Design an enzyme around this catalytic site. Structure first.
Site, PDB file in Angstrom:
ATOM      1  N   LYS A   1      59.652 -72.807 -27.195  1.00 54.93           N
ATOM      2  CA  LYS A   1      60.896 -73.394 -26.683  1.00 54.93           C
ATOM      3  C   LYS A   1      61.603 -74.050 -27.852  1.00 54.93           C
ATOM      4  O   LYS A   1      61.026 -74.907 -28.535  1.00 54.93           O
ATOM      5  CB  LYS A   1      60.605 -74.458 -25.602  1.00 54.93           C
ATOM      6  CG  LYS A   1      61.794 -74.773 -24.687  1.00 54.93           C
ATOM      7  CD  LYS A   1      61.932 -76.206 -24.203  1.00 54.93           C
ATOM      8  CE  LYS A   1      60.743 -76.837 -23.544  1.00 54.93           C
ATOM      9  NZ  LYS A   1      61.153 -77.904 -22.608  1.00 54.93           N
TER      10      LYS A   1
ATOM     11  N   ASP B   1      57.050 -79.324 -17.123  1.00 59.46           N
ATOM     12  CA  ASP B   1      58.193 -80.215 -16.980  1.00 59.46           C
ATOM     13  C   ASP B   1      58.000 -81.552 -16.319  1.00 59.46           C
ATOM     14  O   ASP B   1      58.994 -82.151 -15.902  1.00 59.46           O
ATOM     15  CB  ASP B   1      59.395 -79.473 -16.373  1.00 59.46           C
ATOM     16  CG  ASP B   1      59.880 -78.274 -17.164  1.00 59.46           C
ATOM     17  OD1 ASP B   1      59.491 -78.132 -18.369  1.00 59.46           O
ATOM     18  OD2 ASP B   1      60.668 -77.512 -16.619  1.00 59.46           O
TER      19      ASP B   1
ATOM     20  N   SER C   1      65.950 -73.122 -24.642  1.00 59.24           N
ATOM     21  CA  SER C   1      65.598 -71.734 -24.324  1.00 59.24           C
ATOM     22  C   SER C   1      64.194 -71.403 -24.816  1.00 59.24           C
ATOM     23  O   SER C   1      63.750 -71.929 -25.845  1.00 59.24           O
ATOM     24  CB  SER C   1      66.624 -70.770 -24.911  1.00 59.24           C
ATOM     25  OG  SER C   1      67.236 -70.066 -23.840  1.00 59.24           O
ATOM     26  N   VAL C   2      63.495 -70.537 -24.058  1.00 53.94           N
ATOM     27  CA  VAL C   2      62.094 -70.158 -24.267  1.00 53.94           C
ATOM     28  C   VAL C   2      61.976 -68.680 -24.613  1.00 53.94           C
ATOM     29  O   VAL C   2      62.619 -67.837 -23.960  1.00 53.94           O
ATOM     30  CB  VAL C   2      61.227 -70.489 -23.009  1.00 53.94           C
ATOM     31  CG1 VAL C   2      59.731 -70.338 -23.279  1.00 53.94           C
ATOM     32  CG2 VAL C   2      61.528 -71.886 -22.472  1.00 53.94           C
TER      33      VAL C   2
ATOM     34  N   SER D   1      65.499 -69.897 -19.463  1.00 49.48           N
ATOM     35  CA  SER D   1      65.871 -71.279 -19.742  1.00 49.48           C
ATOM     36  C   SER D   1      64.750 -72.265 -19.469  1.00 49.48           C
ATOM     37  O   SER D   1      64.061 -72.160 -18.447  1.00 49.48           O
ATOM     38  CB  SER D   1      67.135 -71.648 -18.973  1.00 49.48           C
ATOM     39  OG  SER D   1      68.226 -70.845 -19.400  1.00 49.48           O
ATOM     40  N   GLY D   2      64.558 -73.197 -20.402  1.00 49.14           N
ATOM     41  CA  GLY D   2      63.547 -74.246 -20.288  1.00 49.14           C
ATOM     42  C   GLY D   2      64.193 -75.609 -20.158  1.00 49.14           C
ATOM     43  O   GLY D   2      65.429 -75.712 -20.194  1.00 49.14           O
ATOM     44  N   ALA D   3      63.374 -76.678 -19.997  1.00 45.70           N
ATOM     45  CA  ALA D   3      63.916 -78.050 -19.916  1.00 45.70           C
ATOM     46  C   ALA D   3      64.488 -78.436 -21.287  1.00 45.70           C
ATOM     47  O   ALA D   3      63.739 -78.626 -22.255  1.00 45.70           O
ATOM     48  CB  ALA D   3      62.847 -79.049 -19.486  1.00 45.70           C
ATOM     49  N   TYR D   4      65.839 -78.475 -21.364  1.00 42.58           N
ATOM     50  CA  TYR D   4      66.629 -78.852 -22.550  1.00 42.58           C
ATOM     51  C   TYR D   4      66.582 -77.828 -23.698  1.00 42.58           C
ATOM     52  O   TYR D   4      66.672 -78.199 -24.857  1.00 42.58           O
ATOM     53  CB  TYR D   4      66.288 -80.285 -23.039  1.00 42.58           C
ATOM     54  CG  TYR D   4      65.974 -81.285 -21.940  1.00 42.58           C
ATOM     55  CD1 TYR D   4      66.890 -81.549 -20.925  1.00 42.58           C
ATOM     56  CD2 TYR D   4      64.779 -82.003 -21.945  1.00 42.58           C
ATOM     57  CE1 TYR D   4      66.620 -82.492 -19.931  1.00 42.58           C
ATOM     58  CE2 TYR D   4      64.511 -82.972 -20.976  1.00 42.58           C
ATOM     59  CZ  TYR D   4      65.433 -83.206 -19.965  1.00 42.58           C
ATOM     60  OH  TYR D   4      65.193 -84.154 -19.001  1.00 42.58           O
TER      61      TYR D   4
END
Ligand code: 3NW
EC number: 2.7.11.24
Length: 339
Positions: free
Chosen positions: A49, A164, A33-34, A28-31
């Site tokens: 992402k 981030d 999925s990666v 999970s990434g900022a806002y």
């Protein structure tokens, strides 16, 4: 316009250009999925992402715009930057997905400090690079606000990059007492507090302030740094914060040498300068880079600042389609890095 291929990874559909091969979920990434991918065009291992519902609301559309602007601006070795940005959409009308591309990093600091205790030379280099990256981010009037081990990515050769930054607004273990409690004005040194916490943990192998809530967090902090002095109390405008601080059990400032026993005295001296309760007295990134602890790495001619960054949009109140179109202009106007 490249050729796009469709696939599904953990219930989400990925529509990426053909150059991005062997998509594999990394988390999970900022806002969003990666995915780890192989870029056939550069031979680079990349992280892709896919933003989640980027234009669902004004909030999402503004943060999508904010992240893309930030990523497009950052051009530094210890700061995550944009390798590519794409959409499978052929028109603004069709525009609903944003994919962001950066370097795939080996590990995060969270997973490194569990494998396990770093040597003082390794701490020197990793902390150095964080401060070098923060010197640059801070120079563009951008603050991380949530600097922590999980957003510090590193390779086998110890090269580190900050992820981030500039997204957090409004992890508690690394958070400055003032930004968590809204006492004092707060500045970019909120990130220096975070660096202090991370550095303490890299040196001891233990979380410095593992609080359970905002009150327990402050208690753990004040047990080390001491309850605010009279000079600091004068600087608190929040009558709530002031009443509370003056109600608490008075605690003296502990001697860090007696806390971080065994550690390099230069590491202990730097920690004392980073872990100051008074935001006006805390060392800055540029000042910390000239600290004797970084003697073998410090190079004042290779510690750049950023070009100025236009954050005027932050003060604007626009509609979803306006934020979406601005994002679309930023997607189209993108120029990949040179060779
Ligand atoms: C402007 C700030 N935005 C930013 O830095 N975006 C990051 C970003 C922008 C564009 C494309 C990809 C990413 C992006 C890349 C990566 C990773 C790269 N290499 C990794 N290796 C693993 C083994 C550690 S994870 N992780 C996250 N999120 C990791 C988890 N976080 C803390 C939630 N986001």
């Amino acid at each position: 316009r490249p050729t796009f291929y469709r696939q599904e990874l953990n219930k989400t559909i990925w529509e990426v250009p053909e150059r991005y091969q062997n998509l594999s979920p990394v988390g999970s990434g900022a806002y969003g999925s990666v995915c780890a991918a192989f870029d056939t065009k550069t031979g680079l291992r990349v992280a892709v992402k896919k933003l989640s519902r980027p234009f669902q609301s004004i909030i999402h559309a503004k943060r999508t715009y904010r992240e893309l602007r930030l990523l497009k601006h950052m051009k530094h070795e210890n700061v995550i930057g944009l390798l590519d940005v794409f959409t499978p959409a052929r028109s603004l009308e069709e525009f609903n997905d944003v994919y962001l591309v950066t370097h795939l990093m080996g590990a995060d600091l969270n997973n490194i400090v569990k494998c396990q205790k770093l040597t003082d030379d390794h701490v020197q280099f990793l902390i150095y690079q964080i401060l070098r990256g923060l010197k640059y981010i801070h120079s563009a009037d951008i603050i991380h606000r949530d600097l922590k081990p999980s957003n510090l990515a590193v390779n086998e050769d110890c090269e580190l990059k900050i992820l981030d930054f500039g997204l957090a607004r409004h992890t508690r273990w690394y958070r400055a007492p003032e930004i968590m409690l809204n006492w004092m004005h707060y500045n970019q040194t909120v990130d220096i507090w975070s660096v202090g916490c991370i550095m303490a943990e890299l040196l001891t192998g233990r979380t410095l302030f593992p609080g359970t809530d905002h009150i327990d967090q402050l208690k753990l902090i004040l047990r080390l740094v001491g309850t605010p002095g009279a000079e600091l109390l004068k600087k608190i405008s929040s009558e709530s914060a002031r009443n509370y601080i003056q109600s608490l059990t008075q605690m003296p400032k502990m001697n860090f040498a007696n806390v971080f026993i065994g550690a390099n005295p230069l590491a202990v001296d730097l920690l004392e300068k980073m872990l100051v309760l008074d935001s006006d007295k805390r060392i800055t990134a540029a000042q910390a880079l000239a600290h004797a602890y970084f003697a073998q790495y410090h190079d004042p001619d290779d510690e750049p600042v950023a070009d100025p960054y236009d954050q005027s949009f932050e003060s604007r109140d626009l509609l979803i389609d306006e934020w979406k179109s601005l994002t679309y202009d930023e997607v189209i106007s993108f120029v990949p890095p040179p060779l």
